Design a binder for this molecule. Structure first.
Ligand SMILES: [Zn+2]
Length: 392
C-alpha cells in the first residue's frame, strides 16, 4: 500500500511513565507497565511493522527487499538502510548525563571495543558506530533537561554557595577557565567515601538556603540520585525547560541529560554513549574527560531555530542523516513530498492522508511510513503532523 500505518514498539524500561502515552495518545496499558520509549523505524532489535494486505511484516525486512524503491536512490547509496530512529521518550525519572564522542574518537572506541570482541548489544558496550551520530530532541510536553556547560561567570556564581564542598571547586573559583573546569568535572566524578559525602553534605546545606533554579532541579534529581556526584551538574551545565514545540540539537563532546517530560527524539539506530553522572554504573573518567569539550554554550544558542515555509516548519540540522519538520494541517489539502522515505506522526489534532484512491487516518500518537517511490501525499485535518525524512 502507498501509505503504511505503523505498528510500533514500546520499550518498557524501568524509568518510563506508566501513564504519559495512555494520557496523550490513548495507548493501552492495562498491566500499568512503565512505558519509556515508543519506537518508530527499522531498528534491528525491535523494528516497526506494517500489514501486507492482511498479515504483519517487519518494516526493516520490507526495506531490505526493496531498498531503492523504499529509501530513495540517495539514501540507499549513502547509508544502505533507514538512517534514523524516531522516538517518543517518556521520562518519569531523570536519566543519566551523557556525552556523545566526536567522529575521530568514535572510530577509535568502536575499534577498541570490536578488537576486545565485545558483542554489539552487551551492557559493556559504549560504542555502536564508527561515526558520530547527531540527535534532535523536540518537546511534546514541558521538558526538563541539561545541555552543555554554562558561561564561566554563571558557573562561578553558582558554585560560590558551595565553595567549601571540594578544593577542586575552590581551585575553579580562583581562576575560572576551561582547564580548571575540566579538573573540577573529573574531580567531582571521582570523589570517594568521605570526600564524596563531605561534598554532598555541603550541597545539601545549600539546597536549604538557595531558592529557584537550578537548586530546585537539584532537589528533584536528588530524590533519585541522592548519592550521586552528578547532583553538582546543574551548577555546571545549562538547565533548560523546553516548552512544547521547542527543540535542541545535541552536539558531540557535550554533556546532556533528560530530566522530565515527553519528547520526540530523532537519532541513528546506533550511537555512542559515555556516561557522566546520574548513574550507578562505573565511569572511565580519563576517557570521558578526553571526550569532552570544556567550552561554555550561552543560553541563547541552545534551541535550534526553526524555519517556517508555508505550512512547513523545518528544524535545520547540520547532518545529512535525517531531517525533521512539523506540518500544520488545515482542512484544505497540502502536499507533503520528499525524496526519501518518511515517517509521519500525528502530534495533535488528526491527520487525513491521501494517496490517489487510498486514504488513511492518524489520530494523535499514530504514525505511517511513506516509501520514497510514494511521495508526495496530501494531508488535511487539524493540529500538526511531524515528519522525519532525509533531504539529500
Ligand atoms: Zn544523547
Amino acid at each position: 500500500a502507498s501509505m503504511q500505518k505503523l505498528i510500533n514498539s514500546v520499550q518498557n524500561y524501568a524509568w518510563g511513565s506508566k501513564t504519559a502515552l495512555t494520557e496523550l495518545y490513548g495507548i493501552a496499558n492495562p498491566q500499568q507497565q512503565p512505558m519509556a520509549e515508543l519506537w518508530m523505524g527499522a531498528h534491528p532489535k525491535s523494528s516497526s511493522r506494517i500489514t501486507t494486505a492482511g498479515e504483519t511484516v517487519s518494516l526493516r525486512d520490507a526495506i531490505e527487499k526493496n531498498k531503492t524503491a523504499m529509501l530513495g536512490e540517495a539514501v540507499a547509496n549513502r547509508f544502505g538502510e533507514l538512517p534514523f530512529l524516531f522516538k517518543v521518550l517518556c521520562a518519569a525519572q531523570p536519566l543519566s548525563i551523557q556525552v556523545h564522542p566526536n567522529k575521530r574518537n568514535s572510530e577509535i572506541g568502536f575499534a577498541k571495543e570490536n578488537a576486545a570482541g565485545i558483542p554489539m548489544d552487551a551492557a559493556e558496550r559504549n560504542y555502536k558506530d564508527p561515526n558520530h551520530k547527531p540527535e534532535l530532541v523536540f518537546a511534546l510536553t514541558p521538558f526538563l533537561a541539561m545541555n552543555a556547560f554554562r558561561e564561566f561567570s554563571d558557573i562561578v556564581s553558582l558554585l560560590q554557595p558551595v565553595a567549601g564542598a571540594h578544593s577542586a571547586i575552590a581551585h575553579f573559583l580562583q581562576v575560572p577557565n576551561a582547564e580548571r573546569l575540566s579538573q573540577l568535572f573529573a574531580s567531582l566524578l571521582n570523589m570517594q567515601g568521605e570526600e564524596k559525602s563531605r561534598a554532598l553534605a555541603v550541597l545539601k546545606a545549600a539546597l536549604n538556603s538557595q531558592q529557584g533554579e537550578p537548586w530546585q532541579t537539584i532537589r528533584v534529581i536528588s530524590e533519585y540520585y541522592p548519592d550521586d556526584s552528578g547532583l553538582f551538574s546543574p551548577l555546571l551545565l545549562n538547565v533548560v525547560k523546553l516548552n512544547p514545540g521547542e527543540a535542541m540539537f545535541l552536539f558531540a563532546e557535550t554533556p546532556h541529560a533528560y530530566l522530565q517530560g515527553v519528547a520526540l527524539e530523532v537519532m541513528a539506530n546506533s550511537d555512542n554513549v559515555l556516561r557522566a553522572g546520574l548513574t550507578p554504573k562505573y565511569i572511565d573518567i580519563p576517557e570521558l574527560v578526553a571526550n569532552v569539550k570544556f567550552e561554555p554554550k550561552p543560553a541563547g544558542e541552545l534551541l535550534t531555530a526553526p524555519v517556517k515555509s508555508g505550512a512547513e516548519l523545518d528544524f535545520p540540522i547540520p547532518v545529512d542523516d535525517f531531517a525533521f519538520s512539523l506540518h500544520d494541517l488545515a482542512l484544505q489539502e497540502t502536499s507533503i513530498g520528499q525524496h526519501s522515505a518518511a515517517i509521519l506522526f500525528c502530534v495533535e489534532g488528526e491527520a487525513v492522508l491521501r494517496k490517489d484512491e487510498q486514504r488513511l487516518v492518524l489520530k494523535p500518537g499514530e504514525s505511517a511510513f511513506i516509501g520514497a517511490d510514494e511521495s508526495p501525499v496530501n494531508a488535511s485535518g487539524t493540529g500538526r503532523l511531524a515528519r522525519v525524512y532525509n533531504k539529500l
